[PDB]
Amino acid sequence: GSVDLEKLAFGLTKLNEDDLVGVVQMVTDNKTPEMNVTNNVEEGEFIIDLYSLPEGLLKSLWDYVKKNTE
Amino acid sequence: SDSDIRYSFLSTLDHLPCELIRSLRLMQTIDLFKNEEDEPGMERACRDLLLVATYINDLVDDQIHFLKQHKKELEIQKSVTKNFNSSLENIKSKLTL
Amino acid sequence: PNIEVSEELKVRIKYDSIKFFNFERLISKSSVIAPLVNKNITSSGPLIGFQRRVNRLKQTWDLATENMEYPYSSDNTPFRDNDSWQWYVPYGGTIKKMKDFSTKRTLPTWEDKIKFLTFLENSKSATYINGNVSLCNHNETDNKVWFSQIEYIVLRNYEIKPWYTSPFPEHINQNKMVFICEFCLKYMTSRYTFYRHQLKCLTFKPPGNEIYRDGKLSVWEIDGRENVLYCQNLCLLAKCFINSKTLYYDVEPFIFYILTEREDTENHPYQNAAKFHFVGYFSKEKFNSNDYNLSCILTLPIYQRKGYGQFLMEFSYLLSRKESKFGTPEKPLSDLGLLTYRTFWKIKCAEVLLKLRDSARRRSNNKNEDTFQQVSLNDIAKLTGMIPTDVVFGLEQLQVLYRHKTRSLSSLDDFNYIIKIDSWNRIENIYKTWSSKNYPRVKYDKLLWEPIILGPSFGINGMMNLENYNNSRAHNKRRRRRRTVSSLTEYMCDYKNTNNDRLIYQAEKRVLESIHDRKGIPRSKFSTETHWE
Amino acid sequence: LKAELKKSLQDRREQEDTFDNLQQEIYDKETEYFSHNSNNNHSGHGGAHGSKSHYSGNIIKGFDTFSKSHHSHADSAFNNNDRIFSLSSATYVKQQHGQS
Amino acid sequence: FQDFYPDLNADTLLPFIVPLKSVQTKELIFKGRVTTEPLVLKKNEVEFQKCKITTNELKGKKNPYCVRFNESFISRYYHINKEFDGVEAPYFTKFSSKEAPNITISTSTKSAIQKFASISPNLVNFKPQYDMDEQDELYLHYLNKRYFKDQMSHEIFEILMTTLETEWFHIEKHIPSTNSLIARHNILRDCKNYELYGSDDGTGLSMDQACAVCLGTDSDNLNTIVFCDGCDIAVHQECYGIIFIPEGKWLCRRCMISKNNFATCLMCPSHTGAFKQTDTGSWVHNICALWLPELYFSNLHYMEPIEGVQNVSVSRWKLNCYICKKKMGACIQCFQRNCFTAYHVTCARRAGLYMSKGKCTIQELASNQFSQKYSVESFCHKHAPRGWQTSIEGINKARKYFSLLSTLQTETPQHSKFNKTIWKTPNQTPVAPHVFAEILQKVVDFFGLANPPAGAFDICKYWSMKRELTGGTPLTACFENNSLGSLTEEQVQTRIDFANDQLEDLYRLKELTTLVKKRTQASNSLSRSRKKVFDIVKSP
Ligand SMILES: [Zn+2]
Ligand SMILES: [Zn+2]
Ligand SMILES: [Zn+2]
Ligand SMILES: [Zn+2]
Ligand SMILES: [Zn+2]
Ligand SMILES: [Zn+2]
Incomplete structure (x- = not known):
């Protein structure tokens, strides 16, 4: 795997509010069955399964968090 | 060769008298059965009379307007077909038989 | 956090x-x-x-x-x-x-x-x-291009699970949600497109003239080809709630009556227009020999628990009474529609019988009690609107129509069929099922309307292959063309006859008094209880 | 009072004169309207300066006259029944009933 | 009634008689046989939801565009921010002109709309008719950062696109459809296309265009072949569900919804000929939906909706077409014994494979049920029966057509009286010309915006590309389907004189109806005055 998921979550926690909203947006767009994603839009929570996330969206999120944390 | 020139004008030839006769008969019905002493009766009667009067006036007006637009677009298309034929005469060389 | x-x-x-x-x-x-x-x-x-x-x-x-x-x-x-x-x-x-x-x-x-x-x-x-x-979701439980991927439908403010997949353009159907403007009936995918369309459609009313306006309910008598786009949009929305509304594109003939729940919103200090939320409709053919006054009906699921369906059928039949013509809904019918018409025909026949009872009891003291009346299928039909076949099929569900076992046809004076009210209590409860419902009823005075007097076109802007006078006029006037006259010239002077009268209350009073003056029947001709089943 | 009666009934008389004049206006105007086809097809004046537009009948009554092949004399006249615009009001129908 | 008992007639004077568990059946006149069944009915629960947020909270947060000219025009063709509820409020007719919230039509509004009309004669009685979408929001961002210096508004862009749409549709309407010359050119092009590649539309077989759906040449007063003003398709009325024919423009369902596109037939590679929709809404070949077994038509008298999309088994899908070999769509199978080859319906047609609808009329073919009497006999090039010639040449023709489509998808167009003006696109979409650019420029000047002519050209190119994206379907919901089109100059002359006489007629008619309205208001006043006098004359 070309991504360290624990440090990725660390950078996710570092991201600001709008960066999190954007993560939500891109995941809701690229939600596929092999991934395990849940979104309570009524109340407004969002949970993603990193282990099921494929390497594509993983590296995409990695580039995103690099750009928005450094 | 030609066609029944009424068929292109179904709207104003047919559906103008259709709705006209209809609204006229309707106004006739309301007035004929306007119970004279009935206060709300005659109120509604007079109001709907004015209503259907505005309606028929606006219907004949709107058909006038649509026929005006149709006349304009018709003569425009007349000059346009003039253009088209005048042009298309030249390309007979390129276009096949 | x-x-x-x-x-x-x-x-x-x-x-x-x-x-x-x-x-x-x-x-x-x-x-x-x-x-x-x-x-x-x-x-x-x-x-x-x-x-x-x-x-x-x-x-x-x-x-x-x-x-x-x-x-x-x-x-x-x-x-x-x-x-x-x-x-x-x-x-x-x-x-x-x-x-x-x-x-x-x-x-x-x-x-x-x-x-x-x-x-x-x-x-x-x-x-x-x-x-x-989606903006909201609740998906309760117990390749992918061949069938639909549509999952919701948004009218004025709600979302809707579409019961049946409609033939929208692929551009719209392969989406997941689809917004459909309540007034314009335009169907667009992006909520952004809907935002702009709501910013633009300031014509807060549907098209077509208005033939009924009581309180909040209202009807709009949208013609069939004065605005063909709106009607195609309405049909494409309707297919999402009717299983057999296949006539959803070529709608020139159908005179779409459209029910609406008017609302007066002045929340903004500027806007006060009557927002005419489309609610339900019933497409009715423009000329049909088979006596149909309601070809395809629906109220929207978002507006149920309000009896608008029964109201709209009652309005179809008010319209048929106004036309003084006999009509029934189209025979190939919804299984659910079959039961709702069972109920409605039962209730209508019970109501007509109750009117007959109350009138006869107005005439109770002066007319001898042993004298019985003779009502007929047409007597009921001119009162309700349903064809006599419909009236008998909606009376048998009421179980008040009894017959005789044997046939002594030697004497034609003998009674064959009878109407035998078992219990006025039974009938009054069958009718009172609506009283407790508090459903919107057709206040028959508000209707401003007249029959759809066809010319030679029959209303359509073209020609189709399909009473007998015009049905033969169509085929005669048909003649080949590639890419005896003057109908309706006298419909205004059809008042000089008294056989057909103008107003529904006049027709009602006419037939009611005609039957009151019809010869009476003594209670003694057939008082045999066994002979009546 | 009696003065109120005078003022209201004089308003009523004036409005009744106006109403009867509008009646007569529609009457003779549709008269001319339906004679225009007879003076427009056979001896064409308005719908044709010269005898070229053989379809110059009338919208409502004339369906075949709006076909050049219509070379007969079927729609030359009319009757007080076909006078639809007058029949609109009920007062006119009642007057025609009294005069019938 | 008539099926229940004939001893009772409607007018039969039935004696009314009244002294001083029930499980329901189910009638149906089906195949001449009534039905009987207890009360079992649909019990599915309905589901909806009142969403908690409208587009009100989703409105833009900032208005960074300052329309300092014609702002009245904007705000009056848009929205930016016992009296009314009595019987006195009349019934709105279909002609009720909006005099509703805060319209207050002013002389400024009138001058503005007259200026808009003078911008071009096509824009008289203008109406914004297009709603910008998500992808257009970004293009407006790019514009208003590059050309218009952060001053063009969303409404401005919408109005620009709508003027483009209106002008283009006016040119579209006034486009000449056919003369004898261009019709001969079209039919010769079609004859060449068929004699070389093959046609699954029936065109080219003869100078008399044949039926598309049923490949026939019959035409009588009840089954007369129609022609489409959108493409060279000809379909029998019964064989295509043409229940009525309007007098002018007849457009197939494709030419009416997917206006001209070469949209995809979910059960075929080829994309020409007759089409209907599905219950889902993808254009399926009618000949396909006929000959594919699990595909069936719903309304046999309209033939409109195709059903059976999900009912096909994966065997048919994973079958292979030995004609085009595209790994997509469905494929019928031959009837030869011990045979399992497959091919698309239109593939078989184009390649000239032996097909036979049997003795079953096209109604019986779409009847959704094939009886042992029904035999929809299609064969292979080695399984075709006697009397039919081997279709090796047809295989070659189909392969040529499809490999030609492929080499086109690979190939590129290799680039004073002479004028080779290109105004279409390979998708038959428009190209907004220089006059359209001038018109948009006029509109921008009207609104008082920084107005680069290059910006006008950019907007026109963007509109052309927006139409190419949408795929033929108009950007807006505009339609004036009156067919000026194929008429001839002399026919237009007759119609103009006819319309002159009818204009005179309608003028005197409006005279009569104005007298009618006046007399009706008079009669209203009459009833009012009658009450106003009799109230005191009869009641002191
Ligand atoms: Zn709208
Ligand atoms: Zn055919
Ligand atoms: Zn077409
Ligand atoms: Zn196909
Ligand atoms: Zn193939
Ligand atoms: Zn084979």
């Missing part, structure tokens, strides 16, 4: 849904995320309809992109070169001046196409979260 991560590598987040859906923020962040799209992001599930569209456009402009299944074949004719006459006579010659029909400065270039596709791809991350994603 706002975010957390469990040890199983699941990231719980919290965001405000309004900020999430805000269009300007959404499209800005979409252009932000735009390049970050990994073209190798997997597609092992539902292939995006928007992505299908954009890949079609790419392979159309021949920008080689085969990251997905395959490109499609039919895109053009091989002779797009300088041989097509259209390149030497542009616009059919509609433009004269060269400085006006030239296009060297507007024929789009490769760079401009790339710019357009770039905006498109910056939008891709914005469309799925705008159209395909």
